[PDB]
Design a protein around this ligand. Structure first.
Ligand SMILES: [Cl-]
Length: 196
């Protein structure tokens, strides 16, 4: 009925493991989800990670130009390896930061989209998940493709995701299938911020 203030961050894998066709599908998914979630008091922020980290837009930048598709469409793929834990650290320290437009008292939600296991990262999940919990970041994770077929591999999604992991993890077989979880992700976020 009424939507409370939420600072919603996306952290998207830009590893060379993602072919250009699939990077474009991820960009369309982030664009569409941000359009569907856009409510009066909602700000968005986007970081791409590989072995490098790019802030495409802060919450303050989104407040100044609240047009998700215009902000996401021009993004170029970083390529390289998959430093998912350092990505989560930079989201918590850099995006959820008053100086970058994050708001006191808003919900803090992160959506991670990963195509593969963490590799090359000097940080473990044990170095970054406690701080994300301390800062109150609700983490949804989307594991795309065959990387996430095995139980061992799904444990990494459970490690990223907020508890209970079954309510915060999505797995899709490929990037074209990202559209199939748009409604579920929207309804979970609206259940957090919606006050009847
Ligand atoms: Cl990698």
């Amino acid at each position: 009925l009424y939507f409370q203030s939420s600072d919603i961050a996306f952290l998207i894998d830009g590893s060379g493991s993602i072919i250009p066709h699939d990077f474009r599908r991820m960009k369309e998914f982030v664009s569409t989800v941000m359009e569907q979630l856009k409510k009066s008091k909602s700000l968005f922020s986007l970081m791409q990670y590989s072995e490098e980290f790019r802030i495409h837009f802060t919450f303050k930048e989104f407040q100044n130009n609240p047009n998700p598709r215009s902000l996401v469409k021009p993004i170029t793929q970083l390529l390289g390896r998959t430093h998912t834990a350092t990505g989560i650290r930079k989201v918590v320290r850099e995006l959820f930061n008053i100086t970058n437009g994050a708001r006191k008292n808003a919900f803090k939600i992160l959506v991670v989209i990963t195509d593969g296991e963490k590799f090359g990262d000097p940080l473990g999940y044990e170095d970054v998940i406690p701080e994300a919990d301390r800062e109150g970041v609700i983490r949804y994770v989307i594991g795309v493709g065959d990387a996430f077929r095995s139980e061992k591999s799904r444990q990494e999604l459970n490690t990223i995701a907020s508890k209970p992991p079954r309510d915060h993890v999505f797995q899709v077989n490929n990037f074209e299938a990202l559209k199939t979880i748009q409604n579920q992700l929207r309804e979970k976020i609206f259940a957090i911020e919606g006050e009847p």
